[model samples]
Target: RDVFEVFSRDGTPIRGFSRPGPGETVVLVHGVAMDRRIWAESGFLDALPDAHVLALDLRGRGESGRVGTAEGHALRRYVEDVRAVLDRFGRARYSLFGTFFGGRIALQVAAVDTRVARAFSFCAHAEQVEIPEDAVEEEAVAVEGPGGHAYLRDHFTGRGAPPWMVEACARVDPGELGAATRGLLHGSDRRTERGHPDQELVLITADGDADLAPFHAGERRLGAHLWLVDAPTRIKAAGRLAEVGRRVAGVLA
Candidate 1:
């Protein structure tokens, strides 16, 4: 009932949605552990009402892309996948919006590609901070131990996630979230390679983000056009419930 088109990236067919509009192209890049659906919920597609929208399921997070083991996870692998998408559909340089790690990758691509006229990035970091040690340890146990479901059940509840969100996460295919997480945490070596973006970047942050303060400062040092979305917590930030849309709109123009 929804639009699902497949494009090959590193031998994997990535699922992306392309909504036609008045000839402008807008590519939405989702964050770590999320897929194209997040963009839909964020009103990214809706805000640019006259533009073509393409939202992709990053490898292992959504219907497209493959889930892999820790050994198979690679940082630039998904970046390469995005490159393939641009090669196939990017008729001209376009405007791009990316969040979290995806934004970092998009910045890397846009820096070298002149086709990208402008880019907006939200909550992207250059270095790793103290992730929940329990989350990582539990995931390691889940990877090497018994069935993965139980571990996820524990992980979600332990995070104080609402029961329904936990249930929804449970319904997510293990191959997608499981392999993806394993690859995301252990596979990609993003720890040492942050802060590489150098461009006329648009930076977005909230009031109560807690990850890597050092990295946040680095993003600021990039001479980016910065804006605060006034989110009190990551939940409201992710909820797209916050009214950061007008802030973004004003920044874009």
Candidate 2:
């Protein structure tokens, strides 16, 4: 693995590790509060032993540059962050696998970047979601407070979130957490579109999810393939990330 750095279109320095391999090239994108470390920690990295991997620390997380304002953390900026990494590698074709919010970012990237041969979104659908204004603001307030990390730790712990997911919250900057939350309101509510006819798009969610409408909607609208794993809720569904990774590996093969 070699360390690589690239500047986003907005000039934010994005950093991550690249593992060279003879198989398919895959880029791993993590959730809102997560860094590049989760790939190995969650056992997903080992699932694709022969495939080349590129895992990045998005802006305001891990070793990447911090963006303090809600405007700075906009969804478009995230697309830019990943695109910068894509440009640096200059791969003719790459597959993208992302978790939670990162999944949305990957879908959005596929809507614009033809270099993405395949996009797999775990626990997030591509349909337009109505971001509840009041609830999100309240959440931002709770998470960006002085005890922000504790807030996330306790909230996620109570809901049976994965240990790595809970630990990831503490690693994120509190200010950026708030900004990223508010960033959702900026432009994330819009539905993502398909980039090309042959580009493969996949969306994964909990098998027992009570609200499966959006996932189905994505299938009808974007022609996305929907896969459900054994879980009850989206948060708990994270436990299946590595398992999903194995499934993605099969597709890569």
Clashes of 2: 0
Off by over 4 Å in 1: 1-9, 127-137, 140-171, 185-199, 251-253
Model 2 scores worst on lDDT over the 10 consecutive residues at: 237-246
Over 90-152, each residue of candidate 1 has an lDDT whose tens digit, in order, gives 466566778766777666656556666656766664444555646865665563444666666
**Residue 62 C-alpha lDDT in model 1:** 68
TM-score of 1: 0.73
RMSD of each: 4.4, 0.8
Give per-residue lDDT, candidate 1, residue 127.
42
Against the reference, the lDDT scores of all candidates come to 0.58, 0.93
Question: Evaluated with TM-score, which candidate comes out highest?
Answer: 2
